[PDB]
Write a protein that binds this ligand. Structure first.
Ligand SMILES: Clc1ccc(CO[C@@H](Cn2ccnc2)c2ccc(Cl)cc2Cl)cc1
Ligand SMILES: Clc1ccc(CO[C@@H](Cn2ccnc2)c2ccc(Cl)cc2Cl)cc1
Lengths: 589, 589
């Protein structure tokens, strides 16, 4: 409802026009402005629908002569907030900081000011239908514009740093949502120099938000990479540099696991934003995960695939015997016939026993089953789990059949094995493009192919009913006619033909008209097919391939036993360095 | 095991931290550094796990004030090598040459030095898990950094040139592995000016390595082409230049054959490195091999192809008669029936008689059967040789049949003729792309097409077994069902259909679901097919085409008789120039 906000904006700009006693500061009046304030007691009594006063329009643009003489009439006129609903609690300076007019700040500070007044306006929250998000306190509004010395001023009158908004946002992590670099790189250093000077206890960069998240990792998953670059020079310590060779060490007390089950490895694959895929760019991450996948990833990722592919060939093989009397069992083959599914019942309970907790860890299917990188393949994993139970609902009431839902389930079940097809030296990006464009361009012609075939079917059905179903027998009745022309569009079976004394009149030219559409429309599927790989997604299938490896190793580390996983790097102990657990990669120029 | 090297590196950097009596040179201490050396006899006794002493950290970066006063305490402290296993035998200056600090070399040379101490460190050999390879002697370490005058210094104290390492590497050919050009172009001249001054006898550029190879050809097959450019100006001699026309002569006493069976023509097609294909770039090679292929190559490359294509049509034709009694031979047709394979037995012994010596010339199949440019086609040449022998194992025990291995062999045998399909005016790069991408992208869908068809087959088999095999008869049993759906995916034969009183329920919608996968997945093979030729290998199929010609002429020259091959160029004799055998190409500006 942006037009609901647009209801109240133009009310003020001619309400100041209506009453002729207050708007003269907006249009730089001097001589008549010095007349109206002394003859009447009408200085403070002018309030708009917002709660508007004479200083906010004087700081709309800088009215230097307007804010000069009104302190003689009312010096307390600045310290009143606004009262309307979209601008609840917002005062005089709150517009006079984003103007970056340093000649304006000498007046209203020494003549009565209060920096602790926060700005709780309704147009100030983070929202998709609101453009800017600049924070709560005017220190944050000074930090957003990127001015170096006016932010010098308000600190020198007892400014607080640790104050947040109603949704827990401090002064620091509002920089990483804003895309500019050239002012956020320099302002970060001298503002972090003005700490408590007892910095490790009640740390200002370790205090969580209202969600409870350490504000450095917001920059990690929203991926403004220059902060991820710039904080790594505070942790750097050189060891030896010899010519074009140098050494470096890697501190990863935050890049770890068991951090109260809120590590960023859980959450870098959780974002739905497109820039966030390339956070694997710099050396603290990429050579770490490349060692973690080479040392423990590949020699364990294949053995469960082996024990799965021999699981399902056994369940496939044992189900080629189950119809036995459809056209009470004690024989010799009945023992292996029994254990063939007595294995798969305790093998089929585990596929829900391991796949319900990651469902209620997320909380909803709307944040589980949409990710391309996490994998939409779970929709067949969940329906493989129910068939076995259903297979058992038949043997309490003894209904006939119940191998036809098995027929409809076993193919999809067998198709499930290709989710571990990504872990090889190859074959990864081949299965990514198909899942990328089933949703993309297979959807198009499936809404146009069903709508074109049934008119063909009705035109074919209305003609051959004047003759017998014995001479041709292909187009008999309504259900098989649409099926016959639907599969006849795909040039699978040859068109029907007979040569006798009976011959239909209309069928030939409409068959040619069907062929003149089947010779180009099925091939116009191929051009919408082809237009994606050439320029559209040619770069997409490799970065997703190098992101599924960190996805599957973070998903696999949090389920397997501790015995199979130590943490990488070096020990650090026997050396008086503390519990910091460094790491080396070697760089060359 | 790079982490095994990483076990011992950080031990030193805080062991110097632990003992407070030796590390003060590393952190530029002056006043307290002058105290600890006189009160104790503790100057030489500090040794680390490497064998570390006080001068190596003083030459880590340049500690000018540290290496000033320790010669008053121990001037012999520089001439001790290291003792640990990864740094066996490496002394003080060995780090003080790669710093290129010319103010440092005035101290430790005149106060006791020895340039003959080689550096036998374990991190100094050529290895894939080690980054740099800079040589053995500090002359080579001076040559690698590319400094012009500090290499002036150590020559002036009796430096040797002809010394090598344990694997035979002199000072010269360590330049061609390093990719830089702008310092290797100028340093090569004045260092070659400092020869023995009796240069042709015991020549420094003709001394072989430990493998026994003349070090100029390392630059040929590793292909740093600027050395191949720069040495050709020492052999140049102008004759006449008239306007935009000039003449030049070509000395090829090294570009020849019979050079103790170790010519570079054998070995330019042997490398597995990608830059090495474009060594056909400059005029001593390209116009030479273009004359060798035009004069003798094409009028001889076709006649053996003719005598091969009439060989195998005769062997094909004679084998359409051999089953004679499967549903002792003296007739009139038995004479030509006998000689039809009496020709091919002595024609089939030669295909192994000529193709075992190039096997044990290489030594293993791992360096024979992998080359794309040499040709992986030998795998059918080796299996054509065994069928004939097998055909003869039947006629000692008289077993029934043995025309079915002939059936399985004759097609592949007939497919062998296209290895000489490269020698024409055309048709070369057409057969290169297919062999390039059988290994490339035919491998992908062959691991996904077999895994998808058998679930379809089991779903088709589980339904039709409730009915008779008489009404349809297509899906009868397990072995033919997978075969039937495997060839039915390829839209070769039409799908089965019948119209009677019996009609299956589940088959129609799963047939439509098979068709909705067969209409896009077989075409998603074509996009992985298409993505290679457009930008991926469009440049590859012509340079390989102009490299197979030098491959086949060097392979053909070393097998055919001398009568059919003289060497190209001009004679040189009747003229007092010596046995040098020049060549002319003409150049235009
Ligand atoms: Cl009735 C019927 C059921 C399933 C399929 C084909 O399987 C679908 C599964 N699927 C998708 C949406 N609803 C089920 C599939 C999905 C993803 C990939 Cl990568 C590959 C495949 Cl084969 C065809 C007909
Ligand atoms: Cl059982 C069977 C045997 C052979 C073929 C086809 O021949 C293969 C030979 N080949 C390759 C790997 N093992 C044998 C071939 C290889 C290279 C090229 Cl350029 C062209 C071809 Cl046709 C098909 C089935």
């Amino acid at each position: 409802w942006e037009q609901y906000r647009d209801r109240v904006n133009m009310l003020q700009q001619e309400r100041i026009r209506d009453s002729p006693l207050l708007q003269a500061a907006k249009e730089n009046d001097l001589r008549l402005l010095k007349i109206l304030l002394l003859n009447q007691s009408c200085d403070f009594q002018q309030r708009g629908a917002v709660g508007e006063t004479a200083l906010h329009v004087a700081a709309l643009y800088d009215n230097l002569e307007a804010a000069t003489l009104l302190m003689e009439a009312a010096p307390e006129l600045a310290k009143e907030p606004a009262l309307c609903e979209p601008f609840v609690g917002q005062t005089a300076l709150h517009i006079a900081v984003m103007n970056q007019n340093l000649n304006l700040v000498r007046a209203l500070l020494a003549r009565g000011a209060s920096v602790s007044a926060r700005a709780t306006g309704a147009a100030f929250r983070r929202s998709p239908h609101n453009l800017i998000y600049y924070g709560e306190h005017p220190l944050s509004f000074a930090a957003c514009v990127g001015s170096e010395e006016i932010v010098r001023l308000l600190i020198e009158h007892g400014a607080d740093i640790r104050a947040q908004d109603s949704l827990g946002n401090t002064v620091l992590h509002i920089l990483i949502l804003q895309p500019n670099k050239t002012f956020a790189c320099q302002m970060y250093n001298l503002l972090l120099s003005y700490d408590e000077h007892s910095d490790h206890l009640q740390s200002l960069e370790l205090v969580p938000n209202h969600q409870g998240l350490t504000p450095f990792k917001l920059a990690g998953v929203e991926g403004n990479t220059v902060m991820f670059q710039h904080l790594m020079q505070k942790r750097k310590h050189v060891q030896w540099t010899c010519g074009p060779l140098t050494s470096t060490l890697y501190d990863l007390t935050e890049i770890d696991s068991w951090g109260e089950e809120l590590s960023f490895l859980e959450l870098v694959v959780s974002s739905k934003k497109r820039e966030a895929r390339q956070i694997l760019e710099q050396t603290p991450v990429k050579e770490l995960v490349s060692f973690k996948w080479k040392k423990y990833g590949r020699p364990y990722f294949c053995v469960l695939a082996s024990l799965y592919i021999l699981y399902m060939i056994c369940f496939t093989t044992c189900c080629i015997y189950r119809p036995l009397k459809l056209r009470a069992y004690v024989t010799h083959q009945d023992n292996i016939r029994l254990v063939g599914e007595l294995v798969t019942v305790t093998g089929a309970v585990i596929i829900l026993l391991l796949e319900i907790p990651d469902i209620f860890r997320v909380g909803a299917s709307r944040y589980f089953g949409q990710t391309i990188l996490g994998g939409p393949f779970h929709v067949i994993i969940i329906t493989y789990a129910s068939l076995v139970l259903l297979t058992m609902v038949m043997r309490l009431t003894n209904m006939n059949g119940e191998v036809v839902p098995l027929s409809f389930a076993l193919v999809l079940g067998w198709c499930s094995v290709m989710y571990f097809a990504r872990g090889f030296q190859m074959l990864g990006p081949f299965t990514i493009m198909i899942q990328k464009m089933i949703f993309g361009d297979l959807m198009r012609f499936c809404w146009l192919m069903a709508v074109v075939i049934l008119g063909f079917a009705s035109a074919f059905h209305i003609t051959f009913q004047t003759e017998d179903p014995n001479n041709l027998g292909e187009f008999s009745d309504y259900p098989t006619a649409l099926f016959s022309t639907f599969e006849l569009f795909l040039t699978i079976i040859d068109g029907p033909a007979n040569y006798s004394v009976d011959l239909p009149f209309m069928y030939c030219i409409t068959y040619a008209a069907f062929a003149i559409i089947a010779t180009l429309l099925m091939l116009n599927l191929f051009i919408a097919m082809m237009g994606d790989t050439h320029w559209r997604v040619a770069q997409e299938r490799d970065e997703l391939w190098r992101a599924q490896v960190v996805a599957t190793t973070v998903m696999l580390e949090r389920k397997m036993p501790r015995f199979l996983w130590p943490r990488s790097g070096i020990c650090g102990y026997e050396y008086g360095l503390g519990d910091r657990w460094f790491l080396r990669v070697e760089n060359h120029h």
